[PDB]
Amino acid sequence: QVPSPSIGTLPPAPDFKNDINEQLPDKTNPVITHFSTIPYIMANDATFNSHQQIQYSPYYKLVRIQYWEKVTQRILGPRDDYEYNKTKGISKTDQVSMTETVSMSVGADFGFMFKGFSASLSAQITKELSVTKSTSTTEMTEETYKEKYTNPFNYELARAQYMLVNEFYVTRMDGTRITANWTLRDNTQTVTRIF
Amino acid sequence: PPAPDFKNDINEQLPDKTNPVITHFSTIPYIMANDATFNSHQQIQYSPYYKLVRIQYWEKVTQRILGPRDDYEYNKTKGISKTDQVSMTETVSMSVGADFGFMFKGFSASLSAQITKELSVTKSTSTTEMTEETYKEKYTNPFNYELARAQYMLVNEFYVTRMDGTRITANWTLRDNTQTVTRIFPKS
């Protein structure tokens, strides 16, 4: 039988458990949250030609994984500040792969850009993945930047921030990966934990 | 292999990426290789060492035909993504320093001399890991005639391999933005 990805529920970001010193997990367990079936004419397959797609993979699966990445964690002394690295967006290789395999890319607004034949299925695919159609005219980059936090209180405070990470990948009808996982770090979706 | 060029046609579209070639590899012991589908016994019996493999390929940074004296701005990428930095540390205990040398973490520091020698890479002296950055770069046609210009970047990719050749990682892409070749279409 044609396989079906197991859909999961993304749990809430890790939190503090009555401890100031508890190290919080760096990543949380990846959970398949969505997928969407696409015709073979949209999936340029590096090891499959037109003919064998038609008889062996007339459809492909576009899968969405989600998990929480720990952006940073730190204890701060009364009223102390500090800086940390924070990464947003999707890598350059990952955007070239997505555009070359399924004719898609991520725009500067975290939406999706649909190119070629892929444009006919935009409404289906944005719905089934629960992502939105981009209105941007430039592609998202990956950017690692510095972010400062100042402890506002006059007591010691642990603080950890988590970001929502997406991973996307395409798959033959029988389930064989034809790609690596394309990573998109959504910095508009962070959870902050203090104790 | 040589970077693509114009020969005698101004309008030629040049390749987006050359075909990747394997240029180096270094042998590493099973113990610094986190293999997700092998236990310690299977590694020792079936892949007592792994191959860290270095690949190279030219990537067209940009191509453009400019009218007389025309300028333009284009994208350009340096470095290595956070995911790729994170995978390399989880698999082989290494990452890329800010000076494009390799940082050896954990057991890997034992063999830094062997790996950098075998891979033809350098050991980083940096205290900071390389990131990935996309920035704009400007170019202006110096001539009062039409000019086609293409710039190529030499990209490095690294991946790990069981003794028998089985791929156990994605490709880790490193773009050193100072290793470039710049071709112009009327050369003289």
Numbering used by the authors:
A (entry chain B): -3 to 191
B (entry chain A): 7 to 194
Give the published text:
Cry78Aa is a novel protein identified from the Bt C9F1 strain that effectively kills rice planthoppers, with median lethal concentration (LC50) values against Laodelphax striatellus and Nilaparvata lugens of 6.89 and 15.78 μg ml−1, respectively. We also found that Cry78Aa binds carbohydrates such as galactose derivatives and is essential for insecticidal activity against Laodelphax striatellus.
We also resolved the structure of Cry78Aa155-359, which resembles the solitary pore-forming domain, and found that it has an identical conformation with Cry78Aa13-359. After growing and optimizing the selenomethionine derivative crystal of Cry78Aa155-359, its structure was determined by the SAD method and refined to 2.4 Å resolution with Rwork and Rfree values of 0.198 and 0.249, respectively. Cry78Aa155-359 packed as a dimer in the crystal, and its two protomers were almost superimposed on each other. Structural alignment of Cry78Aa13-359 (Mol A) and Cry78Aa155-359 (Mol B) revealed nearly identical conformations, with a root-mean-square deviation (RMSD) of 0.566 Å over 175 Cα atoms. Structural comparison of Cry78Aa13-359 and Cry78Aa155-359 indicated that the β-pore-forming domain in the presence or absence of the NTD was nearly superimposed, suggesting that the absence of the NTD of Cry78Aa did not result in a dramatic conformational change in the CTD pore-forming domain. Similar results were observed when testing the effects of the pore-forming domain Cry78Aa155-359 on the survival of the nymphs: nearly all the nymphs in the assay remained alive under the same conditions. Cry78Aa155-359 had an apparent MW of 23.7 kDa, which was in accordance with its monomeric state of Cry78Aa155-359 (23.7 kDa). However, Cry78Aa155-359 has several characteristic features of aerolysin-type pore-forming toxins. Sequence analysis showed that 20.5% of Cry78Aa155-359 consisted of either serine (7.8%) or threonine (12.7%).
